[PDB]
């Protein structure tokens, strides 16, 4: 998927690398194996015509 | 297949006494949601603080 990782907090057991926020996008928190990292959706720019 | 150890060499086996009274207690532990009793964390998927 589209992923951007930032610094963040320690939220999650860790047993499952994967997680999921009840939606079928994943948080995907602890993305490195040791280290913990977040993705976030891809950034969309709006666009409009007159 | 796998052999841990020697099948026991001993003549027969020990002799067993069974008391269903003695054994047998009055005790109760109802399972509670709220203390989270016997519950199995999804394998799937870590979850967040939702």
Same mark, same amino acid.
């Given at each position: 998927? %589209? ?6 907090? #320690?939220?999650?057991? %860790?047993?499952? %690398?994967?997680?999921?926020? #009840? ?14 990292? /977040?993705? %976030? #959706? /891809? ?8 | *297949?796998?052999?841990? !150890? $020697?099948?026991?060499? &001993?003549? +027969? ?11 047998? &207690?009055?005790? $109760? ?5 709220? &203390? +989270?009793? !016997?519950?199995? *964390?999804?394998? !799937?998927?870590? *979850?967040?603080?939702?």
């Amino acid at each position: 998927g %589209r992923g951007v990782f930032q610094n963040c907090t #320690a939220v999650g057991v %860790r047993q499952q %690398r994967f997680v999921y926020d #009840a939606y079928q996008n994943l948080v995907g928190y602890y993305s490195d194996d040791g280290n913990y990292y /977040c993705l %976030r #959706a /891809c950034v969309s720019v709006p666009v409009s015509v007159i | *297949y796998v052999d841990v !150890g $020697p099948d026991s060499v &001993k003549s +027969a086996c020990i002799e067993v006494d069974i008391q269903q009274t003695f054994f047998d &207690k009055t005790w $109760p532990r109802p399972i509670d949601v709220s &203390k +989270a009793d !016997g519950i199995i *964390y999804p394998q !799937g998927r870590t *979850y967040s603080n939702i």
